[PDB]
Structure formats: structure tokens, C-alpha cells
Symmetry: C3
Subunit: 244 residues, 3 copies
């Protein structure tokens, strides 16, 4: 099994097997909430459409696709012992928030993800990345995974848009996997969660298959009441499959 | 220990021994929050006055008291195995929300109680019953429990009304047992939690005993400060107002 | 190892070994958030400035310091078995709340602190003390501890004032220890950050400061200019040293 090069909350690595079991075949996989890309990186679709609301993420991805070697050589130079400290971290974090260059931004982004508190990605109300230092053993520079993602990106387009736009690019030959921010037990609202299910209803009536993952709750069974439901163990994870 | 025909969040099943230990005796038991009825179903008072804000609940109870066999027969049909899928569950939920007939509504309500997610009873802002499909393997039709509930209902009056009005019907022959929605750690507010205690204080002075049951917290010991308190095993508390 | 005569939420008795290890040396110790006084009672500074927002508390401490025998004598009357019941508890609480007499108030206040639900000190919107009866076995009367407190108070001033005013009293020969009300898992987030900003001002004038709090994202954020140490035992605690 291939690992993602970012640490990402909701990273769906711990349950590929369950997803792969239930995820139908097609020519093209559309992921409206790509995040770290673990589904993408452990399937064999002919092509991929991959999207996210997070503009820094998509921009990193385009860079990794188109400037692989340039990027990896630059990003390795921050994974040295001199940098594992609060003083350097806040220095890098301020550079990132002030920089207007996409490439240097993306070099810093990977450092921020591997050196900051729990690999979180967060922003204050001014749009500034605002995760503090994570105080870590020795962070792993993920070279192998970066090369694996670049190689694999040659069959993908990445877009920065909301789930309703990227789900509209799906067609007769596509499959759609949705992994939205989890339901509760700013950000992503209950209206959108219900909207997501509705869009999925539209796609299955057009013979496009859709699979959604989420927690198992009263609200998730309400929204996905038209899918086939599968419960999965670890609270409980739900998989909702709309097969035409 | 006799069981309730309804699954009901709350439900005093594992507290029964302690409640009965402290619950004084008399002609008549008033329960302003009857819910599923476990205290009713497990005591031997000569008479009961039973009340709840929930009018689907109370209307069901009046039907089970007045038209028992008719009710059992029509409810049992909803439990054949053809009804145990999502399409049917949603169709029945919709049928229930559109119906204006109390008797049909009471039949459908038992289905939804026993087929819906965790046995919840919840309504959206438009007033529609909104609990989703529970996907249980084989729900139990509670036929013995229904007949038991109806035999006992013959000495009971049921009212759909808020706690102050049901608590006013108590007299010197009554005992009053309160099982309000739990204190925390359009729902039932803190103003209402304190109002309940204050109504109790009034009753114990007219010589009518009251037992109230709740979580054990800083706020509940404050509200119930003028009662004898018993702790029980989050902890439970029983507030007893003895004349 | 000396105990505080008051039961006090977030009392620092369990954490003393960690605090002494990290707490620098000097002539004076300023506590902006003294509460029950554990650090005061278990250190050896030549003098002390001790402050809190709670005016019942500071008033009490001036009375224990200045009228010791008379206080211990009268407080003692209240710890008999006739007083360990609800009816009397509620009667005293009302007396406390109605009283205009600092001495009598200080006397009821210890009784309330020890017969009260969890040793809490809380007030309603009307400013009345509102903790209910705590149904305890038999409460310890804190005799020896009172005397230790008064003896040790001879080298202390007490002020009822907010943390920014007490911290302004520190000088070159001072060391500051802050134990603010805890961060989340009433003292506002803006106040939390202000405290760290004042600590930065102080370190810059060559005055050490040490802060105690939960280990969380926010505390790491606020204390980002301090050498951090993580303490074990329940959610995990942080100690933030600002050294010259
Ligand atoms: N309205 C929206 N439209 C598209 N993406 C959104 C969105 N709101 C939040 N997101 C994104 O949805 C993602 C959810 S986390 C998904 C993780 C992914 N399955 C993996 O394997 O790593 C986040 O990246 C977040 O940025
Ligand atoms: N204002 C009110 N007056 C009378 N009954 C009420 C009421 N509010 C709620 N109820 C009813 O009180 C009952 C609660 S029964 C269970 C109580 C339990 N301690 C818990 O919180 O889970 C239900 O029947 C509910 O419908
Ligand atoms: N704005 C403020 N300024 C100073 N003190 C404050 C404050 N707000 C709250 N406090 C106080 O800060 C205290 C935190 S508890 C401190 C406990 C103490 N370290 C011990 O060993 O017992 C509380 O007593 C509370 O009254």
C-alpha cells in the first residue's frame, strides 16, 4: 500500500480495503475532496479528476506534477537538523504567509505539514496559516512518496473548486468518491452535507456511480437514506453507495 | 419486573429498585413525565394520573386503554417481514406525518418506535417525525407488554399537558413522581428545572409527598436543596420531599 | 511539603516538583494568580507580592495575616458536628451573602470552602456566592495550615487586582509565576494572549517569568517565544519558561 506525502486529518489510509471493496470500476475517478490523496494513490483508474477547496493544496499538487525534480531538490533542503526548532519554524511560517511566489510557498507548505502541531492545516480569520510548532522526534522527508505522487499525477487534473463544480465534471465513464469533512457527533455546514447527498442522487439517476464516506449517525443515515449502506468497524464509519 | 411496550430514551428500568425503596405510598400516583411508563407498570397504586407534553404518546396510550384488541390486531400487521426495509420505513414515516387519523397514527407510531434508529422520538422544525431507519435484523412485536399495559391502564387517566398542570391535580391522597429530562453535564430549560423544584416545595407543604429523579450535579443539589437527597450508582440522585 | 488551608480548584500541590525544577531564583516572587497559595507556601523567597481578582480571597488573607489568633479562634467554632448539615450550610451562606463585616465574612468563607460542593468558589449574576452543600464525611479544620500561612505572610503583600496591574509591580530582583485559569479543551482567550504578551515584555527587561497551563494548540501558539516543558499525569500540562 502506498502512503501519501502529506500528513492530513481524515487521511483515509487506515481503511482503503473497505473502500476498494465497494468502489465500482470505470475509466475515470472524480474526487471532490481529494485532501491527501490516498484513494487516488491506491487505485488504478485510467484517469483522475481531483479537487479541493484549499487553494494552497491544489497549488502544491500542480507544482509537484509539473516541476517534480526542481521541487523535490528544493524541499529536501529544509528537512535538515538545523530546522527542527521553534525559532526556525515561526520564521518559516511568517515567510509563507508573506510570500506571493507559488513555488516557494509550496516548499514551505510541506515543511509546515511535517513540523507543525499534528500535521494540521489551519488559517486565522485573516487567511494566515496559524498552526504552531509540533515538537517532533525527527520528521521524515517523504521522498519516495513525492516521486510516486508525481508519476501518478501524469494522469490527473487538479482543480481548486467546491464539491458542486467538481462533481459536475463527472460523466458516463466516471466514478465519484466523496470524503467530505466529517459530520458532527466556519467550515462545512449541515446544509452542504445534505446538498452533497442530493447531488449524488442526481448522479446515480444518470448512471454515474457515487460512493460517500462519513461517520455513522442519525444525521448521516437521514442524508444518505437512498444509498446502500455499509457500516465499518474501528466510532463507526459508514459507506454509502449509489449503484445504478 | 414488567417491561414497557415502547423503547424510550430515559426509561427507568435499571433504577426501579431504588425508586421503589424511597417512593412513599398512597391511593394515587401522579407522573408528570410518564414517558414509557416503567414506574406505572411496576407499582401497585389504586389509581394513576399520567401525563406528558408529547401528544403522540398520550393519544397512543388512550387508544391502548380504550380499544385494546382492535389496536393489537392492526399494529401486528406492520411487523410482518415485508415491512423490514428502508423503502417501507420511509413510506410509513411519510404516511404518519401526513395522516390526520389518530388511530392509524397510533399504529404507525409503534412501527417507527421499533424500526427507527435507536428507538428515538424526534421532530424537525416543521413538526414532522424525523428519525431515520434503524436497520435492525428482527424487531420484537411487544404483544405481551401491550396487553399488560392495557390491563393496568384501566385504573389510569392520561393527559397531554405540561408539568405544572398535571402537578396541580395531586391531592392529599396522592404521591408525585417526577422524571424530568435530565439536567446537563425547544427542549426543557433551566428555568423549568428550577420551577419544578419550586412546585414540589409547595406540594410538600400541602402534605403531598414528591420524589424527583435527576443526574447528580452542582445545579441539581442547588435546585433540590430542601429535600432529603440520596445518591445512586455518572451518578443518579433522588430528591425526596417527605412531609 | 506544606498544604494550603483552602481547597482550591486547580491547586498546584501535585505539580510542585515540576514547578520548583523550572522556577528561577531571585529576591521577590510575584504571583498574579495566587489562588490558594501552594507555590508561595513551598518556596523560600525573601519577599512576596501576591494578587488575585477575587476580593473575598485577598480580604481573607489580610485577616489571616493581621488578625491570626482572633481568626483561628472564631473559625474553629464553625467546624463542629451541629454545622455539618444542609439547613445550617444554607443558613450560613445566606449570612455570608448578606453581611457587610469583613471579619465575619472571612470566617464564613472558610466554612463554605470546606463544607461546599467540591470546594468550589462560584458566584451568580447577582454576585452572591452560590455553591451548594457538599455532604462531606467530617471536614478537616485547617489549623496548622492557617498558622503556617500567617507566619509566612509576614513577608508578603496581598493585592486585589487584575494580572496586568500586579505584573507591573515586578522589578529586576523579581521572578513571576503565572497560574491563569485554564485554556479550553470568566477568563477570555484575548486575556490568555495578553498574558503571554506581558511575559514577553518582562523577559526583555531581564525579569524571568514561568507560566502554567494545559498542553494544547492555543497554549503552544501563545507561549511560542518560551522554552516549553511538558509534564505528565488526564490531559497533560505545560510549563512555559521565559529566561533572560
Ligand atoms: N466545500 C468544499 N468543497 C471541496 N472541498 C472541501 C470543501 N470543504 C472542505 N473541503 C476539503 O475536503 C477535505 C476533507 S478531508 C479528505 C481526505 C482525503 N479523503 C484523503 O485521503 O486525504 C479537505 O481537504 C478540505 O479542504
Ligand atoms: N415540559 C414538559 N412537561 C411534561 N412532560 C415533558 C416536558 N418536557 C418533556 N417531557 C417528557 O418528559 C419525558 C422524559 S422521560 C426520560 C427522562 C431522562 N432522565 C432523560 O433525559 O433521558 C418524555 O416523555 C418527554 O416527552
Ligand atoms: N483577570 C484575573 N487577574 C488575576 N487573577 C484572576 C483573574 N481572573 C481570575 N483570576 C484568578 O486566577 C486564579 C486561578 S487558580 C490559581 C491556583 C493557585 N496557583 C494555587 O496553587 O492554588 C483564580 O483564583 C481566579 O480568582
Amino acid at each position: 500500500k502506498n502512503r501519501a506525502f502529506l500528513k492530513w486529518a481524515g487521511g483515509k489510509y487506515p481503511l482503503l480495503d473497505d473502500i476498494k471493496r465497494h468502489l465500482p470500476k470505470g475509466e475515470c475517478l472524480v474526487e471532490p475532496f481529494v485532501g491527501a490523496g490516498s484513494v487516488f494513490l491506491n487505485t488504478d483508474f485510467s484517469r483522475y479528476i481531483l479537487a479541493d477547496i484549499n487553494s494552497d493544496l491544489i497549488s502544491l499538487y500542480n507544482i509537484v506534477k509539473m516541476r517534480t525534480d526542481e521541487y523535490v531538490q528544493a524541499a529536501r533542503e529544509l528537512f535538515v537538523p538545523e530546522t527542527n526548532c521553534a525559532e526556525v519554524y515561526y520564521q518559516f511560517r511568517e515567510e509563507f504567509n508573506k510570500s506571493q511566489d507559488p513555488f516557494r510557498r509550496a516548499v514551505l507548505f510541506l515543511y509546515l505539514n511535517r513540523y507543525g502541531y499534528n500535521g494540521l492545516c489551519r488559517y486565522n480569520l485573516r487567511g494566515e496559516f496559524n498552526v504552531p510548532f509540533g515538537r517532533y522526534k525527527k520528521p521524515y522527508f517523504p521522498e519516495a512518496e513525492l516521486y510516486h505522487f508525481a508519476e501518478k499525477a501524469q494522469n490527473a487534473f487538479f482543480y481548486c473548486e467546491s464539491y458542486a463544480d467538481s462533481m459536475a465534471r463527472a460523466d458516463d465513464a466516471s466514478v465519484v468518491y466523496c470524503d467530505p469533512p466529517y459530520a458532527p457527533l466556519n467550515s462545512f455546514t449541515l446544509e452542504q452535507q445534505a446538498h452533497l447527498a442530493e447531488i449524488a442522487e442526481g448522479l446515480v439517476e444518470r448512471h454515474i456511480p457515487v460512493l460517500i464516506s462519513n461517520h455513522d449517525t442519525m444525521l448521516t443515515r437521514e442524508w444518505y437514506q437512498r444509498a446502500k449502506l455499509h457500516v465499518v468497524k474501528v466510532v463507526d464509519e459508514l459507506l454509502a453507495l449509489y449503484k445504478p
